[PDB]
Design an enzyme around this catalytic site. Structure first.
Site, PDB file in Angstrom:
ATOM      1  CG  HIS B  77      -2.133  -1.004   0.994  1.00 46.96           C
ATOM      2  ND1 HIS B  77      -3.372  -0.829   1.573  1.00 46.96           N
ATOM      3  CD2 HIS B  77      -2.239  -2.092   0.204  1.00 46.96           C
ATOM      4  CE1 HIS B  77      -4.182  -1.798   1.175  1.00 46.96           C
ATOM      5  NE2 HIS B  77      -3.544  -2.537   0.292  1.00 46.96           N
ATOM      6  CG  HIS B 244      -3.791 -11.731  -2.777  1.00 50.50           C
ATOM      7  ND1 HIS B 244      -4.922 -11.295  -3.394  1.00 50.50           N
ATOM      8  CD2 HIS B 244      -3.305 -10.672  -2.059  1.00 50.50           C
ATOM      9  CE1 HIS B 244      -5.138 -10.034  -3.043  1.00 50.50           C
ATOM     10  NE2 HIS B 244      -4.178  -9.607  -2.205  1.00 50.50           N
TER      11      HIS B 244
HETATM   12  C1  HEM Z   1      -6.362  -6.287  -7.525  1.00 45.51           C
HETATM   13  C2  HEM Z   1      -5.358  -5.964  -6.692  1.00 45.51           C
HETATM   14  C3  HEM Z   1      -5.562  -6.262  -5.232  1.00 45.51           C
HETATM   15  C4  HEM Z   1      -6.698  -6.297  -4.449  1.00 45.51           C
HETATM   16  C5  HEM Z   1      -8.117  -5.912  -4.793  1.00 45.51           C
HETATM   17  C6  HEM Z   1      -6.237  -6.659  -3.145  1.00 45.51           C
HETATM   18  C7  HEM Z   1      -7.118  -6.752  -2.045  1.00 45.51           C
HETATM   19  C8  HEM Z   1      -6.739  -7.144  -0.744  1.00 45.51           C
HETATM   20  C9  HEM Z   1      -7.604  -7.222   0.368  1.00 45.51           C
HETATM   21  C10 HEM Z   1      -9.051  -6.700   0.336  1.00 45.51           C
HETATM   22  C11 HEM Z   1      -6.910  -7.669   1.390  1.00 45.51           C
HETATM   23  C12 HEM Z   1      -7.483  -7.894   2.701  1.00 45.51           C
HETATM   24  C13 HEM Z   1      -7.297  -6.725   3.680  1.00 45.51           C
HETATM   25  C14 HEM Z   1      -7.681  -7.245   5.083  1.00 45.51           C
HETATM   26  O1  HEM Z   1      -8.939  -7.469   5.349  1.00 45.51           O
HETATM   27  O2  HEM Z   1      -6.811  -7.420   5.984  1.00 45.51           O
HETATM   28  C15 HEM Z   1      -5.585  -7.967   0.891  1.00 45.51           C
HETATM   29  C16 HEM Z   1      -4.582  -8.583   1.595  1.00 45.51           C
HETATM   30  C17 HEM Z   1      -3.294  -8.693   1.175  1.00 45.51           C
HETATM   31  N1  HEM Z   1      -2.832  -8.355  -0.017  1.00 45.51           N
HETATM   32 FE1  HEM Z   1      -3.882  -7.731  -1.577  1.00 45.51          FE
HETATM   33  N2  HEM Z   1      -4.970  -7.016  -3.164  1.00 45.51           N
HETATM   34  C18 HEM Z   1      -4.450  -6.662  -4.309  1.00 45.51           C
HETATM   35  C19 HEM Z   1      -3.119  -6.764  -4.724  1.00 45.51           C
HETATM   36  C20 HEM Z   1      -2.005  -7.048  -3.896  1.00 45.51           C
HETATM   37  C21 HEM Z   1      -0.650  -6.950  -4.256  1.00 45.51           C
HETATM   38  C22 HEM Z   1      -0.148  -6.393  -5.608  1.00 45.51           C
HETATM   39  C23 HEM Z   1       0.070  -7.384  -3.146  1.00 45.51           C
HETATM   40  C24 HEM Z   1       1.496  -7.553  -2.947  1.00 45.51           C
HETATM   41  C25 HEM Z   1       2.361  -7.769  -3.878  1.00 45.51           C
HETATM   42  C26 HEM Z   1      -0.894  -7.831  -2.164  1.00 45.51           C
HETATM   43  C27 HEM Z   1      -0.625  -8.412  -0.962  1.00 45.51           C
HETATM   44  C28 HEM Z   1      -1.532  -8.666   0.019  1.00 45.51           C
HETATM   45  C29 HEM Z   1      -1.204  -9.362   1.286  1.00 45.51           C
HETATM   46  C30 HEM Z   1       0.133  -9.930   1.639  1.00 45.51           C
HETATM   47  C31 HEM Z   1      -2.308  -9.403   2.027  1.00 45.51           C
HETATM   48  C32 HEM Z   1      -2.512 -10.069   3.363  1.00 45.51           C
HETATM   49  C33 HEM Z   1      -2.516  -9.226   4.588  1.00 45.51           C
HETATM   50  C34 HEM Z   1      -2.426  -9.866   5.916  1.00 45.51           C
HETATM   51  O3  HEM Z   1      -2.040 -11.048   5.909  1.00 45.51           O
HETATM   52  O4  HEM Z   1      -2.683  -9.207   6.967  1.00 45.51           O
HETATM   53  N3  HEM Z   1      -2.112  -7.635  -2.699  1.00 45.51           N
HETATM   54  N4  HEM Z   1      -5.557  -7.741  -0.483  1.00 45.51           N
END
Ligand code: HEM
Ligand code: HEM
Ligand code: NA
Ligand code: NA
EC number: 1.11.1.21
Lengths: 713, 713
Positions: B77, B244
């Site tokens: 972010h 993810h």
């Molecule tokens: C279409 C693009 C993306 C969408 C819509 C998206 C959406 C989200 C959402 C909604 C969460 C959950 C937030 C929560 O409730 O804690 C999340 C978690 C996460 N996203 Fe994404 N994401 C995107 C792309 C990315 C990218 C590009 C990365 C990293 C390279 C990433 C890495 C993560 C990680 C590691 C988590 C887990 C957080 C945790 O374990 O606390 N995401 N994503």
């Protein structure tokens, strides 16, 4: 574009502490306005201003062939925004040419007045500021028309962006009292720090209170507002009757003819506004306030015809061509000249607020005396005009040029001349050691010097440690200054002083003003030493001690700090959150956010709190100058909650055990809450920051100690 | 408190040019972050970060015992606010810790992640910025979980107040499209410069467009937003699937349990927000997005399970415990571990936006290739992660520390190393004389150098004169650069260069990049001489010439200046007024208001306007460096009006005769309209200011010529 202000409209605003940066300044970093002005040929500027008075421009023709009245009004509004409560407003920074004042309704058509001055401004360039030019032009107007001024001082440096001032909460220009953002409550109590009855007026409504044409009621608003601009009854009468000896008002047609104020006008208007569709839109057809009053038979000459007319006729309520309430002389002949047609005359007219000068009983007496003795009127007006136009300039040391009056006036908070050799660096180290050997503690020394120096405000350049007025009424009795403790500190310091001065040769002596500051310096050096740091706190001598007879006790009342977050002090409960009051005080002290942050964190651990409160004292080594405030505030092992007793006091408890570690106020905890302040607290709360904290603290302490030291500028 | 913004909400805002002044900065004037960082023990920092990963705090317990996933999200972010249109956003200034991004809904609970880093930040102090720490932490999280990163560069200096970014006009967080301030029009066209689908989101809605759970439609938003953050299809897929691979979402209970975001929270929250009343409010009960998805069977280890799951099951639409749309694997066993309870397992789940990677046809092919060839997925993700997290850092010369990747990547706009002696001051005098003897005019020389240097933007440090990219596609073809005229200037300069280089010994040569700038300097010198002044313009050699193959034509398109007030150019009609676009361009050039003012007034009289437009050319001695722009603009003998044909062009006529004297645009006239800009124009249009005008112009010209010179920094 949606901004942080839109999302979080009540978040504290730090941007007021970062205005007037070198970024926004077109002059070089070395530009010194006083030195430019001291080489100005002031006489040549005044001759040009003199010629301008009778050189009509066709785009805004001169009434009666003479711009004098317009320029007097221009200079009176430049000065007339001043409030004694905070010192903000006034003529001292030339803020009439920026928003919002350039577009206040009371400042309508003064855009024309300023534009007439551009050729002279342009000719003399940086050697005369707009701020100084506005006032000078008002003086020259008076002089061209036969009135002898009391003098003039230059030295108002120009500013380059709008000042952040609270002018009120109304969302509608000129809103009548009693709305959702009323500036009035109780029995017509005007909220501090305001000094005008409606948003966008200088003082009062010329029709009467909220438009009600009762001279008696209007007199009450006049007395109140003027008192709030530091003028008493004599001054007020002299000023209004003096002013309204000249020129006229402009109300030739309906106000709906008048277009957008300058900040709203189209780009093609080139900084002008109030463009009028009424007939020619200017000159004989001008509309400014909507009133149409000409006070005297010689509007372009000083006279005593204002009071002759005020007392010589009975007055009848009428309406201008724009529909405003105003008054006309009953049974009078057409004796007042017309501004443009030499074949027309008019009856005498007055504003409701003019009639106040006759129908309020206390004004009436002064007005009669001035009527019967127009030389007293002339002198009172000259003096009041000088005061009005210089009240925010600060100490006499800032006054430049050849017309400065030599008479010292009580309102200037004067400081006697120094007439003896000053202490040197060796003397200062000897006095610091004596102060520390006396048994005065770090906390007493720091607290006393803080109390003395921190009455300064940059808004009107009043206050500060020069004068040693802390030892005089009313300062010695302010609750924030802890009068009993202060008296004992002052008595010890005076014995030290007496012994030092008794031992000297060649007339060298130290003032109590200087010793109070120096003793605070010794406090801070000792606190630094208690923390393992060897520092010298800078000190500059040359302060002098003022007497009680040179100190107006009533005028000094507005410098009382009812809120001082730096000592964790709030005298009563206010509607403004304490953190907002902290930032307000920081702005008046001329501090940036980093300076405020460093200063407050240091003062806490030095014991500067009023009443020895432990709120925010987040250290186990009080009176040592360390960054403990920040390390402890930022420790996530502590959890904070508002107390049951008081929602503005917080307890910090160990998160794991629940043990009570600290207490703090909103002013303490704001530094761990506000995202910009917490970023600053992080810098000083880091493991590499103790040396930086000590250095930055000493720098800001010294800055505060010197705020009023214009003798060293 | 009513402000100037309330009274005149459409007035141009100059305070964005005076942000980030030394007033708001807690570090000394001389603080050099690069030098602090180069002494950081980075290894020690990374050890500490590795320890932190599994040191769970009770106030925000670690999912699965490991904060890696949370920190990856936190870093993605940090970076993911970036927009290619203006270069604003990104990780490079650590703005996630200030308003508004600290409180965006998509940033919920990253306040917890940043607070977890405080003890490390505190330990290492100024030697590691927050900006650098957030990224490094994301790298360490990846490494701790078995993923080998492509590298890391330090050097992101911290900033101390919020950046002035247009994030949209909506007045409601997360507002769906089609409202009164819609960022969308036509066939789902996102307005420039925005790169997110809803106010307060990073890129897209995880439930689908405007909450509609169609993976195919969601793919369209993903492709568009990500393209607007400089990522193509392969990078996009590798990033989303890579990210993810780790961690989980948080939606354990209804969103109505979640309280105020950080900027709205109570002071006792000490900078944190989204406090939740659902059960324990954290850990197993956490609510962040409202979704409840865990993607893989080993959420704390790198794996190839994302794509195994995506392709290995069929998906069914269901709802999280907070009511959000999300997908569950049809008929699957409970194979996904629980984040806190060792005795629970769950079925595989996905977001709508995850399914896009399979149901968009172009993504599906990449997704399959990554599934079948996991090593390509790994390498693509490592590369895209480095890009994402460094895209706003600027040229490679700014990259610090021991983990900088040696491979040069196209997106860095690379510049070859200089491998020859540079020209000296004698050589520069000789080249300037040749340039003047060639017959190139002041106007050609100035215009070409302006064109070359003014592509720089400080938001992401792309652009500028280094590289001589003006001679390559697409810069050479941009309308604002006057392709035909540019080609003739470049051809003459290249013959000069060829003859100079052919005469040298040792390997000394001059680059075209350097010669274009030098030649502009000679133009300014000549212009100054034309006005009677003897001026030498500073010049620093060392720029090198990039090739076409080192210059990505698509990524370069966003630097095209569709508005350049400095050349009085507007490529089409826009909804933002031109004077606002001028100030925006000045901000990207790192200019203050006084700099913008001086610069523009000079360019106008030197013939820098595109197409030789006479708008704003207020002088009768074009190509002479004088302050005529200001003197003539401020001349009240001229009256201005918008023309009948075009309301954005104004005619300036003699007030007495009506004769046409000049024409100007909004960009020209704003300097005679806006009260702060006009104050600045007054300084330079005064009779004493011709020398100050010339010298301030040279200083700002030199500044622009050097913006990208990080090889000298
Ligand atoms: C279409 C693009 C993306 C969408 C819509 C998206 C959406 C989200 C959402 C909604 C969460 C959950 C937030 C929560 O409730 O804690 C999340 C978690 C996460 N996203 Fe994404 N994401 C995107 C792309 C990315 C990218 C590009 C990365 C990293 C390279 C990433 C890495 C993560 C990680 C590691 C988590 C887990 C957080 C945790 O374990 O606390 N995401 N994503
Ligand atoms: C109760 C206090 C005051 C009120 C209500 C008041 C009101 C007004 C009004 C409404 C106008 C007409 C503006 C227009 O339509 O052009 C005006 C004019 C003027 N006032 Fe005042 N005023 C007050 C005090 C002062 C003071 C203290 C001074 C100066 C010492 C001053 C000097 C002038 C002058 C010279 C004009 C004439 C302007 C011209 O000739 O264009 N007034 N006043
Ligand atoms: Na003031
Ligand atoms: Na950026």
């Amino acid at each position: 574009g949606t901004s942080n202000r839109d999302w979080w409209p009540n978040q504290l605003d730090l941007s007021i502490l970062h205005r007037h940066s070198s970024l926004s300044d077109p002059m070089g970093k070395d530009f010194n306005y006083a030195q430019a002005f001291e080489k100005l040929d002031l006489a040549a500027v005044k001759r040009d201003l003199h010629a301008l008075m009778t050189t009509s421009q066709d785009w805004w023709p001169a009434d009666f062939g003479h711009y004098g009245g317009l320029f007097i009004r221009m200079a009176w509004h430049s000065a007339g925004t001043y409030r004694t409560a905070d010192g903000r407003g006034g003529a001292g920074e030339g803020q009439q040419r920026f928003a919002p004042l350039n577009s206040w309704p009371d400042n309508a058509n003064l855009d024309k007045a300023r534009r007439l001055l551009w050729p002279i401004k342009q000719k003399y360039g940086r050697a005369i500021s707009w701020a100084d030019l506005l006032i000078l032009t008002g003086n020259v107007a008076l002089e061209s028309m036969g009135f002898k001024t009391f003098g003039f001082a230059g030295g108002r440096a120009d500013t380059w962006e709008p000042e952040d001032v609270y002018w009120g909460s109304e969302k509608i220009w000129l809103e009548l009292s009693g709305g959702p953002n009323s500036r009035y409550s109780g029995d017509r109590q005007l909220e501090n720090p305001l000094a005008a009855v409606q948003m966008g007026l200088i003082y009062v409504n010329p029709e009467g209170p909220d438009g009600n044409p009762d001279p008696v009621a209007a007199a009450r608003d006049i007395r109140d507002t003027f008192a709030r601009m530091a003028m008493n009854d004599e001054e007020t009468v002299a000023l209004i009757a003096g002013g309204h000896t000249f020129g006229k008002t402009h109300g030739a047609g309906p106000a709906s003819n008048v277009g957008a104020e300058p900040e709203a006008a189209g780009i093609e208007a080139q900084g002008l506004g109030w463009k009028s569709a009424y007939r020619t839109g200017k000159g004989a057809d001008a509309i400014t306030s909507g009133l149409e009053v000409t006070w005297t038979t010689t509007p372009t000459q000083w006279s005593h015809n204002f009071f002759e007319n005020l007392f010589g006729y009975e007055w009848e309520l009428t309406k201008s061509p724009a529909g405003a309430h105003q008054w006309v002389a009953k049974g009078a002949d057409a004796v007042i000249p017309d501004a443009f047609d030499p074949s027309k005359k008019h009856r005498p007219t007055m504003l409701t607020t003019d009639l106040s000068l006759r129908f309020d009983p206390a004004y009436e007496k002064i007005s009669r005396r001035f009527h019967e003795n127009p030389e007293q009127f002339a002198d009172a007006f000259a003096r009041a005009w000088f005061k009005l136009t210089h009240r925010d300039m600060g100490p006499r040391a800032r006054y430049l040029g050849p017309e400065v009056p030599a008479e010292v006036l009580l309102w200037q908070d004067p400081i006697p001349a120094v007439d003896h050799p000053l202490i040197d660096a060796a003397d200062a180290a000897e006095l610091k050691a004596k102060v520390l050997a006396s048994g005065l503690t770090v906390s007493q020394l720091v607290s006393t010097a803080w109390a003395a120096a921190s009455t300064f405000r940059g808004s009107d350049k009043r206050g500060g440690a020069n004068g040693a007025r802390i030892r005089l009424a009313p300062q010695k009795d302010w609750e924030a200054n802890q009068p009993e403790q202060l008296a004992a500190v002052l008595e010890t310091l005076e014995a030290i002083r007496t012994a030092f001065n008794g031992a000297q040769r060649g007339g060298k002596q130290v003032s109590l003003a200087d010793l109070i500051v120096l003793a605070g310096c010794a406090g801070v050096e000792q606190a630094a030493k208690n923390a393992g740091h060897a520092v010298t706190v800078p000190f500059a001598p040359g302060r002098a001690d003022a007497s009680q007879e040179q100190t107006d006790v009533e005028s000094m009342a507005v410098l009382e700090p009812v809120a001082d977050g730096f000592r964790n002090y709030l005298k009563g409960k206010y509607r403004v959150p304490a953190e907002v009051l902290l930032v307000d005080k920081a702005q008046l002290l001329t501090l940036s956010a980093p300076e405020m942050t460093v200063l407050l964190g240091g003062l806490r651990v030095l014991g500067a709190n009023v009443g020895q409160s432990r709120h925010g004292v987040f250290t186990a080594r009080e009176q040592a100058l360390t960054n403990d405030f920040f390390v402890n505030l930022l420790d996530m092992g502590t959890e904070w909650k508002p107390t049951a007793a008081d929602a503005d006091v917080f307890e910090g408890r160990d998160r794991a055990t629940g043990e009570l570690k600290w207490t703090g106020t909103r002013v303490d905890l704001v530094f761990g809450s506000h995202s910009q302040l917490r970023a600053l607290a992080e810098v000083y709360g880091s493991a590499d920051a103790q040396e930086k904290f000590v250095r930055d603290f000493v720098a800001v302490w010294n800055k505060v100690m010197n705020l009023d030291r214009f003798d060293l500028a």
